[PDB]
Structure 1
Amino acid sequence: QLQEKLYVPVKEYPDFNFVGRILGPRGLTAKQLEAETGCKIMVRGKGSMRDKKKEEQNRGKPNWEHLNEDLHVLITVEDAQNRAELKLKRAVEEVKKLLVPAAEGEDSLKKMKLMELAILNGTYRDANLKSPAL
């Protein structure tokens, strides 16, 4: 299969729960992505299926298997279709706006369309040496 793992260093963000951010209230979207894109985007690292019931009975399984990795979001698409990966990558890219340690899941949506759309450009030039969204 094909997997693309978008790492978020949970060691870097102890105060930002990417799990509570990504699959917490929006776990539905992870399900929608696998259902629609054909890619089962699994959050790997510590906290994927961190359910107490799971560590009891579902223990030893993929959830804990990748629990020993660092928290990252992985679009796992089982197929060779490039059209497949294109579909999950766009969806997961919206997650890329989500796995940001931002306090909220907005503002950036508007700011990135406006300014972050073209950060370094003729108007700035030197901003190329230091852009916020590197």
Structure 2
Amino acid sequence: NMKLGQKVLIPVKQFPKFNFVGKLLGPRGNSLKRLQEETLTKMSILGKGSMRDKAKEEELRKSGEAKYFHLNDDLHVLIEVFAPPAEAYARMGHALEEIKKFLIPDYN
């Protein structure tokens, strides 16, 4: 068994008005949690703008604690997997395909 991790950009700069976080979570907040289970991965929204309170986010980023280093990156989904190699890579490929629709706007 091995761990894989892959960041996937949430393209905020490119589409600054689209509610990506709401798209990812769905109206009940369940959607990303469900998708991680469907693909046998773990998926977390990390990076700048990923905390609810902007001021706290800046404090945490300035703290320099390792657990907040992610706050220096652009907003992203981190997909992680732990499985035997062939299966780890397959799960990641599946997750990467499934996440696509949530990372582009669905209206102009």
TM over 0.5: yes
2:100 corresponds to which residue?
96
2:81 paired with 1:77? yes
Counterpart CA distance in 2 for 1:29 and 1:46 is 21
Residues 91-115 of structure 1, C-alpha deviation per residue, up to 9 Å, x if partnerless?
Answer: 44222012112229xxxxxxxxxxx
Whether contact under 8 Å (2:39, 2:91) holds in the other structure is yes
2:91 corresponds to which residue?
87
Farther off after superposition, 8-17 or 33-42: 33-42
Q: CA deviation at 1:40?
A: 0.9
Which residues of structure 1 form unaligned runs of 5+?
Answer: 105-134
- Counterpart amino acid of residue 40 in structure 1: K
Paired residues in the alignment total 98
- 2:90 is paired with a residue of what secondary structure? helix
Runs of 4+ with deviation above 4 angstroms: 59-62
The structure, 1 or 2, with the larger RCO (C-alpha pairs under 8 Å, 6+ apart) is 2
- 1:2 is paired with a residue of what secondary structure? strand
Counterpart CA distance in 1 for 2:69 and 2:28 is 23
Normalised to the residue count of structure 1, the TM-score between the two structures is 0.54
2:14 corresponds to which residue?
12
Whether contact under 8 Å (1:19, 1:47) holds in the other structure is no
Structure (1 or 2) with the greater strand fraction: 2
Counterpart CA distance in 2 for 1:83 and 1:25 is 31
2:39 paired with 1:25? no
- Aligned-residue sequence identity (percent) comes to 45
**What's the Cα RMSD here?**
3.0
- 2:49 is paired with a residue of what secondary structure? coil
